[PDB]
Tab-separated table of N, CA and C and ligand atoms in Angstrom:
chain	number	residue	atom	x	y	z
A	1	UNK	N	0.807	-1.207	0.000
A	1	UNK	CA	0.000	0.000	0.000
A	1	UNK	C	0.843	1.260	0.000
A	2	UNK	N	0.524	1.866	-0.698
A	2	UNK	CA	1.428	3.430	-0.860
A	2	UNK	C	0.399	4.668	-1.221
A	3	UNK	N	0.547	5.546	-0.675
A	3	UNK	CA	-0.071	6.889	-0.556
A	3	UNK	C	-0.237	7.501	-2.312
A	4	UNK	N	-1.621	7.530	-2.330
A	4	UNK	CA	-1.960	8.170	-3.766
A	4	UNK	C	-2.362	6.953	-4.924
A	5	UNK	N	-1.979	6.238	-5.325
A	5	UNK	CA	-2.091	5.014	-6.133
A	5	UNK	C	-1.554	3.962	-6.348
A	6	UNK	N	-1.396	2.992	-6.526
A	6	UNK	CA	-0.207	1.661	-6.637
A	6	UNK	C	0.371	1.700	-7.962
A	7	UNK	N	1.574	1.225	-8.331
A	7	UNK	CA	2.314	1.378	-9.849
A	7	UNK	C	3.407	1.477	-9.208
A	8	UNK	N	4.450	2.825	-8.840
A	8	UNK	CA	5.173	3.612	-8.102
A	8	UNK	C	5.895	2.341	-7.367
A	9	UNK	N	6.620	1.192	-7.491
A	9	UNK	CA	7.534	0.418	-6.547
A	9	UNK	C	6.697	-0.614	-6.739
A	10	UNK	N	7.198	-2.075	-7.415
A	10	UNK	CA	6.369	-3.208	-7.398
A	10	UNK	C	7.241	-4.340	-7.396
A	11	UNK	N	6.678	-5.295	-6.761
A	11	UNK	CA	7.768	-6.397	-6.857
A	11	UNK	C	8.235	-6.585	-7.974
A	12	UNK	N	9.464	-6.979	-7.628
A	12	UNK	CA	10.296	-7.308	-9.474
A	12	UNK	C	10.122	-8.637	-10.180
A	13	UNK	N	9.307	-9.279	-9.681
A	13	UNK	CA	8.273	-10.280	-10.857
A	13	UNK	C	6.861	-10.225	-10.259
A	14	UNK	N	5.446	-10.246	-11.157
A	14	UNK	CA	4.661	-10.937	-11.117
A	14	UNK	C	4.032	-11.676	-11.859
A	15	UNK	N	3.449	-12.309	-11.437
A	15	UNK	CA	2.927	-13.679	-12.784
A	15	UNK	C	1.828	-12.929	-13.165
A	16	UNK	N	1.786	-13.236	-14.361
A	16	UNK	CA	0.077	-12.781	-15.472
A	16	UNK	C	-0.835	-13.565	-15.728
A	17	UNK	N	-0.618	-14.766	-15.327
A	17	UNK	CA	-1.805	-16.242	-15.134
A	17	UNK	C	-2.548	-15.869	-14.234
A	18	UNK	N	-2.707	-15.010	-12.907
A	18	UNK	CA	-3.638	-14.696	-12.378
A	18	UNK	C	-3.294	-13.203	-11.554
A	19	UNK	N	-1.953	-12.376	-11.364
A	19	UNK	CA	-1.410	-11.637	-10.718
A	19	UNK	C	-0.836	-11.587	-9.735
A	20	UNK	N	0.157	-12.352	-9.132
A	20	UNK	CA	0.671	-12.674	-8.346
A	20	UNK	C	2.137	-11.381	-7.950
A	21	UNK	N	2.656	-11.885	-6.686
A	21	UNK	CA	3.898	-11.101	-6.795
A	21	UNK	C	4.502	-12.166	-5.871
A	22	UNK	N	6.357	-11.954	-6.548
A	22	UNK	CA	7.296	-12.935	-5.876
A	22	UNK	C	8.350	-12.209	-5.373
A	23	UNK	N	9.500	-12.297	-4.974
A	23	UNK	CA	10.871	-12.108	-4.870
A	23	UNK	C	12.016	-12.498	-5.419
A	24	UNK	N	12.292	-14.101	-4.763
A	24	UNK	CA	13.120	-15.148	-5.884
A	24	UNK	C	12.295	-15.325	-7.020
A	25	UNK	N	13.126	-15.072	-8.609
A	25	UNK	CA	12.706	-15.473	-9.519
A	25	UNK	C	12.227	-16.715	-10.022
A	26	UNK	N	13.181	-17.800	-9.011
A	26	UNK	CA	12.469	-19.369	-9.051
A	26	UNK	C	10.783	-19.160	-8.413
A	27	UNK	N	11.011	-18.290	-6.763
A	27	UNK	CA	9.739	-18.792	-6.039
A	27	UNK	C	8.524	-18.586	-6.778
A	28	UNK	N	9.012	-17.927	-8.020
A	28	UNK	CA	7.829	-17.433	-8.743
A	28	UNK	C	7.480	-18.789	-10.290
A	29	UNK	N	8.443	-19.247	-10.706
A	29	UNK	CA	8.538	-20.238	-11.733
A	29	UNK	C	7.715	-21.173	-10.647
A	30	UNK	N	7.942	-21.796	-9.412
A	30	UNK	CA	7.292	-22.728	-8.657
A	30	UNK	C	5.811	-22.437	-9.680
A	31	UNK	N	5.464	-21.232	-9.010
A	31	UNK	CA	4.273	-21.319	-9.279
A	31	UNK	C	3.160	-21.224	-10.380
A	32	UNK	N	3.744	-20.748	-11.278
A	32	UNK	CA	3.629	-21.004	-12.621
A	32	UNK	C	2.720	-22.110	-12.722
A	33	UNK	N	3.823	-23.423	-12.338
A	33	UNK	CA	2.876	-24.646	-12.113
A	33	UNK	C	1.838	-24.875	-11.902
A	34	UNK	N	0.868	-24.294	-11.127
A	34	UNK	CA	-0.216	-24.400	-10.704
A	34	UNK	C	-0.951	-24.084	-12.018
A	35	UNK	N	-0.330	-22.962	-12.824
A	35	UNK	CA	-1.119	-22.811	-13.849
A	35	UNK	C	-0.789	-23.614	-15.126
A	36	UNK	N	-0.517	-24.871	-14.652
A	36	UNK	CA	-0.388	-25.651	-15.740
A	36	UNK	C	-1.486	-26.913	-15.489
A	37	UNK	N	-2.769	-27.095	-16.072
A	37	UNK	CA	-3.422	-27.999	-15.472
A	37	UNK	C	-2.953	-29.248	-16.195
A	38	UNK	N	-2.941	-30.363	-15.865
A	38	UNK	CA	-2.429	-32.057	-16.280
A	38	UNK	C	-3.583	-32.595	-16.698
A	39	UNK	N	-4.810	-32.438	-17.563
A	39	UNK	CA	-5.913	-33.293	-18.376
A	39	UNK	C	-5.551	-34.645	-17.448
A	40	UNK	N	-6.430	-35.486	-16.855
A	40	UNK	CA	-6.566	-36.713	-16.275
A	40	UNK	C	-6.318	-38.094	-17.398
A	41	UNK	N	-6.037	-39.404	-17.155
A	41	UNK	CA	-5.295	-40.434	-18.098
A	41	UNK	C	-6.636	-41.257	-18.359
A	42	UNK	N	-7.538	-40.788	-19.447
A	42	UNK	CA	-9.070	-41.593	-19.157
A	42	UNK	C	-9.852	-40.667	-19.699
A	43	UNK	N	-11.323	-41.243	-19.658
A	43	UNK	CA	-12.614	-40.090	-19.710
A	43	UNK	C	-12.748	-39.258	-19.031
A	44	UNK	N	-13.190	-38.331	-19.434
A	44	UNK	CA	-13.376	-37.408	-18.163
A	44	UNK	C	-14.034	-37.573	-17.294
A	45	UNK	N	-15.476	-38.046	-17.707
A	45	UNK	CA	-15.876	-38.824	-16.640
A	45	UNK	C	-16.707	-40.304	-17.016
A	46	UNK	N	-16.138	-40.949	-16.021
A	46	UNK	CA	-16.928	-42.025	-15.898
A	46	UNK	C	-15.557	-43.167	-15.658
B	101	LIG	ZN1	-0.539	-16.898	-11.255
């Protein structure tokens, strides 16, 4: 939070799959992952 609007100082990565913010450039690749969904080995259902 910063006085007047946000932009002005932002973490130096965030992800664009949903808006995230990181520090380590890995801790942020971790998560990436999540936005990778794995389709199931089968029907979808049944
Ligand atoms: Zn994300």
């Amino acid at each position: 939070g910063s006085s007047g609007s946000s932009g002005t100082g932002e973490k130096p990565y965030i992800c664009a799959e949903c808006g995230k913010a990181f520090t380590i450039r890995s801790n942020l690749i971790k998560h990436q992952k999540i936005h990778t969904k794995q389709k199931p080995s089968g029907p979808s259902s049944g």
